[PDB]
Write a protein that binds this ligand. Structure first.
Ligand SMILES: [Zn+2]
Lengths: 42, 94, 705, 125, 39
């Protein structure tokens, strides 16, 4: 995965949860890609 | 309310859009505001919750600003339990 | 509900609450107090709902006080009269005849569009008329705005438009008469893939592809067949010189040193050996050619801490090139370590500069790090950027700060891990990325020369580095003419001052080519900053024509990205039945053509990844062993004049055969190929026979294992 | 609660207020030092008031008292875990130093101890 | 008997050297200490 690190100066903004949800798409993307590389063909 | 020079009918000049963007920023409140909570929480302000089931159904926090001004927004930060295995159905309403 | 603010871990969260009805009620100037209610709804410590919260924190942020009085009616104007919103949409459509709309004005109208979407996210019975009108005007001209924002704009405008569109995704509390944004955003996204190889930035198409990968869950067939057609087109385009191929065979050098333009540079702090798979997070930092690095000068240092380095127009041009340099790798050493070693360092850039991206390698002996930036004083304009407490797990990556801050002084505070042993370690400074020229609109956020002379000196630097790159290319070509060309095929090539000088010449050519390309991106950013625009995608443009007229490095990068999307698409089936559309368009000869056009001349990463695509898509097909026998027979002949890396593609072929050993046709077809091969033992080709018998020996070793 | 009650009772009676014996070669009364005001009173002879983070008020509220072995040192002991702390630094945050040097201290985990906050004494003065 | 190209191109896909640390040791009689220190 990636580090759980987000912009602290952007917390004063309204899109902190927006960047947070973009980051969890990115992490699920990385996990799904690693799973597709590791898994074989049934 | 009529007889006011609005900010909509003007053409898209650079200075009017720049003033609109510079308007839409937000600032931090200073000095400290006022707030009270039920006593199950012990201690920009923070609290820690203690396991009390006397008023677990409802919780009411009261907030009084130091001055009546232009309300930008309210930031509500929370940290949950580390052993959570299911998404809780808990709501917070202003 | 709580589901609109949970973090990635799920153990914390944050909400930012505001509404237009708040200021609508504050227009009376009467309200001063508020209540908030926490309530658990329902359809060891058995904490339920409100008892599940551990730690709480409350803050209240006020609005900015401008010089424009009576702001109450000005804010109620957009909420009451809706004719502003479609006008904003008109400023997105470029249909107005009042001049030409610049990128800064588009950024401003998109910012206020984001703000109005945010306030219109939750309407507690408040009139949503204006919100419905602006959403309808967005959906009416969605193709035009996505075209003018993600194809005809830079990184900032496209990133802001992606932010606005995903915020429109986030607040999808639509009425039952209104359809969701998903289907329509999917259709608008696939209506503009044809203009993809004529794009400008890797990060723009990266966020584009992220949105595609997220929203593709609704409809699968149209995106799949469009993607397959674009695979076929760019694969048949990429095949069109033996020069980089000869480089790839002799030295494994895949980046073209003669093509002067790239697309993006990918690096991270975390050839590739295929044995472990027999790097996913490396796409975290994209688009590093539009943003140049800086240079580091340490000023302040804490106790027990030392920063070390890890191991007349021509003069002005050389000095500007020296300012435009990637610095060598440096690091921090600590004299005495302990549990929570608090150390502090200060770095100086020498001048005010725009900072956009920061990368800190993984340091396994440090608990947390925190970065502060300031230009004049620590208490004057100091704002906290990021504190990370899991440096030992992964690396710190922060990409494309929007809006980009300006700064001159970096403060790094590090706290060591608990129970840390007293063994010395290194904390690398990483790589810092920013903008050399500070734009006037970005200067006003927080002795500046004029645009024209600065643009002229970068153009002079671009010309000088182009001459240097051309002479480096000529030297590299004249040196590679002197490479030994034995008649011993290629077996002796895999079995030296000449090699070292070729490697040095290639490294120099790559360095100057990268410098030239990022300088070209700098002159392009200043040219669009003058008031110009980048390449306009005309409506009469043939997609195949702009496919052909695209740079080869851009084609390679776009292939790797959208086949990454294909890997994610194949994994999104969760091991269930693959859709029949991509299983039907990827028949035998199409698969063979894709293999012969991508795996022969492509980089090893995209080669292995497309092999993984082929086994995860058509792994159970009956024709795989026959395809392997044909590609072995038509690649490893003694009369084969094609210059391809036989060894690495042979090991990859063994790997993909070892993957497809689940199919029963591969072993039968390879033994039949052997039977055909030594049929004259009922002329002889000793090297190719040796290749195929060692291949089947490795495959049988996998069978035995 | 009981600690705050007994500290308030001790504060209401001046006859039950012994003098603060801050000096070398003389141990302090730990039961009397349960109040926060006594702990922050022990730092009158602190030679490092000018430090940014080694100020008397932020470090005394963490549960520390000055018990110097001589005149001019910076020996501050905890009144619960009695952690030996010497050679204080201007960058030494009191909460972080108490967590690092004594993670088993009940102030670090936040459980309820015999500590008496200054607000209770000020509200019962 | 010469080494051909196959041994070269398979040797690395996976000057007299010691092989004692790779192997294990044993004895037919129960000794007071094991002999792996010799290896
Ligand atoms: Zn203690």
């Amino acid at each position: 995965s990636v580090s759980q690190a987000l912009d602290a100066r952007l917390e004063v903004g309204l899109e902190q949860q927006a960047e947070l949800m973009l980051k969890m798409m990115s992490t699920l993307e990385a996990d799904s890609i690693l799973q597709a590389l590791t898994n074989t063909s049934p | 309310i009529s007889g006011v020079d609005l900010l909509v009918d003007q053409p898209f000049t650079l200075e009017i859009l720049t003033s609109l963007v510079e308007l839409t920023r937000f600032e931090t409140l200073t000095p400290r505001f006022s707030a009270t909570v039920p006593p199950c929480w012990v201690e920009t302000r923070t609290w820690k919750l203690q396991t009390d089931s006397n008023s677990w159904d409802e919780h009411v926090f009261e907030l009084v600003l130091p001055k009546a001004c232009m309300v930008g927004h309210v930031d509500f930060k929370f940290v949950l339990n580390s052993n959570i295995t299911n998404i809780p159905q808990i709501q917070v309403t202003l | 509900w709580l589901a609109s603010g949970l973090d990635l871990s799920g153990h914390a969260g944050m909400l930012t609450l505001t509404s237009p009805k708040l200021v609508k009620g504050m227009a009376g100037g009467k309200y001063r107090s508020f209540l908030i209610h926490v309530k658990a709804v329902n359809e060891s410590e058995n904490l339920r709902g409100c008892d599940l919260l551990q730690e709480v924190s409350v803050t209240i942020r006020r609005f900015k006080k401008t010089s424009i009085s009576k702001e109450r009616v000005q804010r109620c104007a957009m909420l009451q009269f809706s004719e502003f919103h479609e006008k904003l949409v008109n400023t997105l459509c470029r249909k107005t005849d009042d001049g030409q709309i610049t990128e800064h004005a588009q950024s401003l109208v998109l910012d206020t569009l984001c703000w109005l979407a945010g306030v219109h996210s939750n309407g507690p019975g408040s009139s949503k008329e204006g919100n419905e009108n602006l959403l309808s005007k967005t959906r009416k001209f969605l193709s035009d705005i996505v075209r003018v924002c993600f194809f005809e704009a830079g990184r900032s405008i496209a990133h802001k438009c992606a932010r606005f569109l995903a915020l429109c995704i986030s607040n999808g509390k639509c009425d039952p008469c209104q359809p969701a944004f998903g289907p329509v955003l999917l259709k608008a996204l696939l209506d503009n893939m044809s203009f993809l190889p004529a794009a400008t930035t890797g990060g723009s198409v990266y966020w584009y592809f992220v949105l595609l990968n997220y929203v593709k869950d609704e409809d699968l067939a149209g995106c799949s067949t469009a993607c397959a057609s674009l695979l076929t087109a760019v694969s048949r385009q990429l095949q069109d010189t033996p020069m980089e191929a000869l480089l790839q065979t002799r030295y494994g050098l895949y980046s073209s040193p003669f093509d002067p333009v790239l697309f993006d540079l990918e690096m991270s702090g975390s050839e590739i050996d295929l044995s472990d798979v027999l790097e996913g997070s490396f796409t975290s930092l994209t688009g590093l050619l539009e943003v140049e690095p800086l240079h580091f000068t340490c000023v302040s240092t804490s106790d027990g801490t030392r920063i070390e380095r890890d191991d007349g127009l021509a003069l002005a041009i050389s000095h500007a090139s020296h300012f435009l340099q990637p610095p060598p790798h440096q690091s921090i050493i600590i004299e005495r370590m302990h549990s929570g070693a608090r150390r502090f360092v200060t770095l100086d850039f020498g001048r005010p500069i725009l900072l956009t991206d920061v990368l800190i390698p993984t340091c396994g002996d440090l608990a947390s790090l925190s970065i502060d930036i300031w230009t004049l004083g620590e208490e004057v304009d100091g704002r906290r950027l990021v504190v990370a407490t899991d440096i030992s797990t992964h690396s710190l990556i922060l990409h494309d700060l929007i809006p980009p801050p300006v700064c001159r002084f970096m403060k790094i505070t590090v706290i060591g891990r608990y129970g840390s042993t007293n063994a010395r370690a290194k904390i690398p400074l990483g790589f810092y990325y920013g903008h050399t020229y500070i734009l006037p609109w970005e200067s006003e956020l927080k002795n500046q020369p004029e645009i024209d002379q600065h643009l002229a000196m970068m153009v002079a630097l671009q010309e000088d580095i182009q001459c240097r790159y051309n002479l480096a290319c000529h030297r590299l070509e004249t040196l590679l003419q002197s490479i030994d060309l034995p008649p011993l095929n290629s077996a002796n090539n895999a079995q030296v001052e000449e090699d070292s000088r070729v490697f040095s010449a290639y490294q120099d050519c790559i360095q100057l080519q990268l410098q030239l390309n990022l300088a070209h991106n700098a002159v392009q950013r200043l040219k669009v900053a003058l008031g110009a625009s980048r390449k306009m995608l005309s409506e009469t443009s043939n997609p195949e024509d702009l496919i052909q007229t695209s740079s080869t490095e851009q084609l390679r990068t776009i292939i790797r990205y959208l086949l990454d999307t294909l890997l994610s698409l194949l994994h999104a089936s969760n091991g269930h039945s693959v859709p029949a559309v991509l299983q039907s368009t990827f028949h035998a000869q199409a698969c063979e053509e894709l293999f012969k056009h991508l795996c022969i001349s492509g980089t090893p990463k995209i080669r292995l990844h497309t092999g993984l695509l082929l086994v995860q898509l058509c792994g159970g097909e009956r024709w795989w062993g026959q395809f392997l026998s044909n590609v072995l027979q038509e690649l490893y002949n003694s009369e084969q004049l094609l210059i391809f890396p036989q060894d690495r593609v042979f090991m990859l072929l063994s790997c993909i055969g070892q993957r497809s050993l689940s199919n029963s046709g591969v072993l039968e077809s390879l033994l039949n190929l052997l039977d055909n091969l030594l049929s004259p033992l009922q002329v002889l080709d000793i090297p190719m026979i040796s290749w195929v018998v060692m291949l089947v020996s490795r495959l049988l070793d996998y069978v035995a294992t | 609660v009981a600690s705050s009650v007994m500290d308030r009772l001790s504060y209401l009676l001046p006859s039950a207020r012994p003098e603060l014996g801050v000096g070398p070669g003389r141990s302090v009364d730990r039961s009397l030092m349960y109040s926060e005001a006594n702990r922050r009173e022990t730092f009158t002879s602190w030679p490092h008031v000018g430090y940014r983070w080694a100020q008397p008020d932020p470090m005394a509220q963490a549960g520390f008292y000055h018990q110097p072995a001589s005149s001019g040192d910076d020996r501050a002991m905890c009144f619960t875990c009695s952690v030996c702390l010497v050679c204080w630094e201007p960058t030494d945050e009191p909460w972080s130093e108490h967590e690092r040097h004594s993670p088993n201290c009940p102030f670090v985990k936040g459980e309820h101890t015999q500590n008496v906050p200054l607000s209770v004494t000020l509200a019962t003065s | 008997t010469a080494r051909s190209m196959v041994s070269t191109i398979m040797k690395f896909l996976d000057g007299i050297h010691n092989f004692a640390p790779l192997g294990t040791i044993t004895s037919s009689s129960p000794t007071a200490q094991p002999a792996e220190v010799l290896l």
